[PDB]
Amino acid sequence: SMAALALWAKSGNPFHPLLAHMLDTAAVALAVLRMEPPRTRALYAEDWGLPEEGALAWAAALVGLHDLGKASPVFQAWVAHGVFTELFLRRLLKEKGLPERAANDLAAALGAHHGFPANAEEKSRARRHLRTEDPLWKEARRWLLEEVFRRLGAPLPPARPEAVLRVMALASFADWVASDPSLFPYGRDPRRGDYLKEALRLAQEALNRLGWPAFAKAQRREFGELFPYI
């Protein structure tokens, strides 16, 4: 069963499914895009040729896939998991209908080196692992991507470098926030219909806390969007 394999994959702790971490990451992305200035949100709408509401859902779902590279036996019970995320997304984003060049760039945006593509030696090592894994893993990773896109209600766009870099920086920040169990406690069940509403509430609380005077001390401006400088 590919669904069981997909749900069994863990992130960061045996009691925290990878899917829970991916949905938490998407929830932080969506919450912080809603708080960005109107100029920033209009940039996303223009980047992707979507009404603003669809553009933010698209971007949030993409960012949720940052740790999709963990959906491999290599990371469950050396090359960084982000190299796997990049290889998986090059294929998976094209199957969803994105044109080759946009898929390849977004795959690197969500990879191991903050938007710069994995090198030949990293990819050779990863592909060595991929050749000997159980084939069900390839199916499980497609299942996980479909679950996030479906949960977020993400539409496909009908990609300029700044658009890709905007997703890169957003994914770096959202994955960081969602990775802190003090903000996003382990043990929530992502099979539940109420999971995303609860993850959005936790995201709003976390963004509020990270902004408090003893944490945030200035702002980081990157590619026309803003984050707290911690």
Three-state SS annotation for the chain: CHHHHHHHCECCCCCCEHHHHHHHHHHHHHHHHHHCCHHHHHHHHHHHCCCHHHHHHHHHHHHCCCCHHHCCHHHCCCCCHHHHHHHHHHHHHHHCCCCHHHHHHHHHHCCCCCCCCCCHHHHHHHHHHHHHCCCHHHHHHHHHHHHHHHHHCCCCCCCCHHHHHHHHHHHHHHHHHHCCCCCCCCCCCCCCCCHHHHHHHHHHHHHHHHHCCCCCCEEEEECCEEEEEC
Quote the domain boundaries for residue 73.
1-230
Q: Does 113 show up as a binding residue in the annotation?
A: no
The one-letter amino acid at 128: R
Q: Report residue 41 as tokens.
A: 């949100």
- Cβ distance 226 to 220 under 8 Å? yes
Q: What is d(CA 218, CA 122) in angstroms, rounded to the nearest whole number?
A: 36
- Cβ distance 203 to 185 under 8 Å? no
Q: Does 175 show up as a binding residue in the annotation?
A: yes
Q: CATH no. for residue 36?
A: 1.10.3210.30
Q: Does 66 show up as a binding residue in the annotation?
A: yes
The structure was resolved to a resolution in Å of 1.8
Query: How many Cα neighbours within 13 Å face the side chain of 99?
Result: 7
CA distances (Å), 44 to each of 54, 74, 131, 160, 172, in order? 10, 35, 37, 11, 17
Nearest to 203 by CA among 60, 15, 7: 60
Q: Does 21 show up as a binding residue in the annotation?
A: yes
Q: Report residue 166 as tokens.
A: 């905007």
Q: Report residue 189 as tokens.
A: 């069940």
Count of domains forming the chain:
1
Q: Residue 52, Cβ neighbours under 10 Å: how many?
A: 15
User: Any idea of the CA torsion for 38, 43, 49, 51, to the nearest 10 degrees?
Assistant: -10
List Cβ neighbours of 119 (8 Å cut-off, separation of 6 or more): none
List Cβ neighbours of 221 (8 Å cut-off, separation of 6 or more): none
Q: What is the CA radius of gyration of the chain?
A: 17
